[model samples]
Target: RAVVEAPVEHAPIGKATLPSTFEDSTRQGWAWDATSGVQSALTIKDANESKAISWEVKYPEVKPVDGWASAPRIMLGNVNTTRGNNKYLTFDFYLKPTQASKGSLTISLAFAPPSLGFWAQATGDVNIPLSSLSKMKKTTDGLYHFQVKYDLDKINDGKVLTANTVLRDITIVVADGNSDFAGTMYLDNIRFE
Candidate 1:
């Protein structure tokens, strides 16, 4: 469905809709884990025709320098949704734990247009415990769907986007288990519906 915004006082009303997949050409740019004896292909991969995925690269604050791996950033494309007060978003994802035991994990989002930085609300970022086999869904092979409703009518930072403000840019940020938890995770099937 086309997202509709109220008619701007001076500017004409415009529409925007979120995408169902991450195939837009603007979504690109990445390098392999170029640290030491290991080569981690990607934190992001093509739609799993069968099953090739990604893992949350090690965070330097917790893991040693060499422990770091390639970190992939998924751009949510330049979406121009209506300047509606409430806009909802949802998506499906797969998270699989490797050798280590299951732990805590988190996902975040980054907004660009106005450059308000990045933030993840509790409902927006779903936490998955790797050990819970019952928690993982077979259809997704493990990834879960997260839904969040945001307000475009409100002031983002200091400025209030006057017209049909484009939610210009979006980035996905994932975090792995900080302590003993280690594993691979993948995100896909994002949608505005």
Candidate 2:
């Protein structure tokens, strides 16, 4: 299923189906946690085999920069969706955190092109300064949507991306967790759904 935008769209997602490669029947409930740490490796859809999966995070103020972490970050990759040929893949996003220091986290997307020796990573460490996670969160804790766009629709090389192309051992180190701050913020909503 190809994701296309409607004529008059604010920030459109590609399609409706969850693309066979994406599956998080349990983690999909990540929106349940209102406090620290990612509910799971991925609270929802992580494709060690799909094309793309990402969302936006709003970092408020975190405290005691040491030992603990602040502002959460999410990632997806290790995609093995290379059937025969490879094309460009992209995701859209939008974020605004109160302070850049405690509101930003890293978003890394990696891939193993045909001509490349080792896998390369495309990283996005943004400061989503929203008032709170009220936008993408469910009444009982859910995901918020934002206008974050990650464009990689340029690589048209002939690479056989295995189902594991996007499933690498990656980490989202909270470089600002040590900032030691805390507060209430907001996250609108995230794309890639």
Candidate 3:
């Protein structure tokens, strides 16, 4: 005789999500352009009651052909999302200089499309000065928290970022003012909220 079983209860559906933390050391999709005269390394370490991503970058004397001092790209596997209810992208970072250096650095954020190359036209390019980041208030966790909200409806000059918008990668472009510098940047608590 066939017996009927009770239906399993399921949680209510929620908005799509992506990986928000770097707890998994092996799962970080960190990549950089070494051919462009930038040397860098990425690692995950214990910090702030959890794990965080650490990047050590050494700026070369020769500048990149594209004018960017360093390009660190995080490949997100082309995740599709509609920006969800949480519109702010937040993270904590700590920057420490390993070598005495003199120069201006501007870090910018950009989002790449699924089909376009990393060097192609990216959307929502936002420039954040290194000085500004350095001056940000640090919490008890010993990290500077950065929160940014980009206009999804106006991304790519009015091209709305819908559910079908496939975000292939997130690039952090570091533009230096012709100076050799070395530093380590620690990132943690990366999330959309």
Candidate 4:
């Protein structure tokens, strides 16, 4: 198991504990690559007992680069998963009603063999439609609890996520053609276990 971004209430424990939370004003390890009409930051909120990353975007209307209107990425600094017994990658996210009412979200993992360079990157993606998120359980704190899990053995047709795999980063893409969506999303508890 590897803790990429520990949850607010739990101490990070795993093979590697990389930067992922926003304890202060800094972005931590979070970043974004999008054209115009999008904004994101590490926002501190009192609800979850700690901070989380937020992304506000106007999708489709914004320019798409690398097949995404807005891409929010968490830098992992080439963590080698072979060192740990990682089997699944999981995380939690909350979407505002304004955003969940429409649009789509895709979570992806960028992977490359330890012997390969950045140019040889390969990715596996899991798409979560905003419409389906309405069924997720909402916590008493007024936050929707949505847990996402991806089997590493099945990512990229089981070819890219091997023992020699080096995880480059994790990216969340916001884009759904047609809808002029504008809303904010919060993310937390990103880990590989």
Candidate 5:
């Protein structure tokens, strides 16, 4: 009897280390995919700021119950995966509160077991009245930090919990009810802590 290993295709097992800063798009594994009508750019501030380089985006008509299907919803993929309740994910960002009273935006973290279809995933979305995001308090350096801890036991996906779970992406989207509103968002230091 002979034992053989099947030659499954190699997907290069996407890099797991989250970029500490998105200052250089040319850097390996750093890229932004945005929707139409929405613009993404790198902004640099003066030396006094704790964060010098950051990613920025602007979208119009961020609604209350209908998410922007295209550009308004930004999703980053190939994010590093981590397992267990002990792991924490943190997102550092800044947003100018929208002038429009009717529209609002929310953030979400999407987790998957790897290679699941785009529509099939779990989201830990912050609900409106926006209390879910309150823990992301502004800092002395003028930025907000959002942190989340993922526990496989609590995710309710019904999949067998394992020693490893690969998260596919992190998304920042205007909540489903936003309507006729527009604003800019700045992001930096997205990491697994």
Candidate 6:
């Protein structure tokens, strides 16, 4: 497979030994599909019934690794690109502060099984707020996805994850160990491929 990122200028970012399997949209400003819900929604209201994995519980090891430019996150891989739906690569997460607050968190969605190629004017950081979104569509319960465009896209990057990478996990960014930034954003029904 081939990896194509939004690409960066002068600096050349998103070039890594191993790709994150995140793909970039052709016309979009340089955003990627953060997570593709293979096992997206399985609601169980009761906490102690059979399984009740919280955002942190369902994902314990979702964090940034060493040498990475951004914070920690969770990812899903091997998506179904047959759908031909670009808007479905949407994400909906919630947040609640347990203690106080930290710096900030960034979430993204990119094409996976990425290629080594790169792009400029669309690769970098994507830290968007919950407030800056439109076309808010609700699928199941609290799960949501920004239909057309959102306002929270405070950050953006133009790069593709390395090839051989999978896109099958969720990303939970805990910036600077604030302890608070804790909440839940029910996720489901992601249009992809």
On residues 78-98, what C-alpha lDDT tens digit does candidate 4 reach at each position?
344452577766767665555
Best by TM-score: 4
Q: Model 5: per-residue lDDT, tens digit, 1-193? A: 2222243321122233464454442212332334423334434432124333333343444322435443334445666455455345555555443342443455555554464443223334553333333455555643444443333343444444344655566544534344333444555566655
CA lDDT of each prediction against the hidden true structure: 0.41, 0.32, 0.50, 0.52, 0.43, 0.29
Candidate 2 Cα errors over 4 Å, as ranges? 1-79, 83-102, 113-115, 123-127, 131-143, 153-193
Candidate numbers sorted by lDDT from highest down: 4, 3, 5, 1, 2, 6
Please report how far candidate 3 places residue 53 from its true position, in Å: 1.5
- Superior by TM-score: candidate 2 or candidate 4: 4
Q: Candidate 4's error at 18, in angstroms? A: 3.6
Q: Candidate 6: list runs displaced more than 4 Å.
A: 1-53, 57-72, 82-88, 100-102, 114-125, 128-180, 183-186
- Clashes per model (N, Cα, C within 3 A): 2, 52, 0, 0, 11, 55
Cα RMSD, each candidate:
12.2, 13.0, 12.6, 7.6, 10.6, 14.0
Ranking by TM-score: 4, 3, 5, 1, 6, 2
Residue 117 miss distance in model 6 (angstroms)? 7.3
- Report the Cα lDDT for residue 103, model 1: 58
Give model 3 RMSD, 1 decimal: 12.6
Clashing pairs in 4: none
lDDT of 2 by residue, 87-192 (tens): 4333333222333332333443444444344454444443453334434443222223344433333223333344334423222333343232232222222222
TM-score of 5: 0.55
Looking at model 6, report the run of 10 residues with the lowest lDDT sum. Answer: 22-31
TM-scores, each model vs. reference: 0.51, 0.34, 0.62, 0.65, 0.55, 0.36
Q: Poorest 10 consecutive residues of model 3 by lDDT?
A: 7-16
TM-score of 4: 0.65
> How would you encode candidate 6's per-residue C-alpha lDDT over 79-161 as one tens digit per residue?
21221223233333433223223333445443332231211111223453434332354434433333222222221453333
Question: Between prediction 2 and prediction 5, which has the larger TM-score?
Answer: 5
lDDT (tens digit, per residue) of candidate 1 on 80-137: 4433443544555564444434455555444555433332222344455556654545
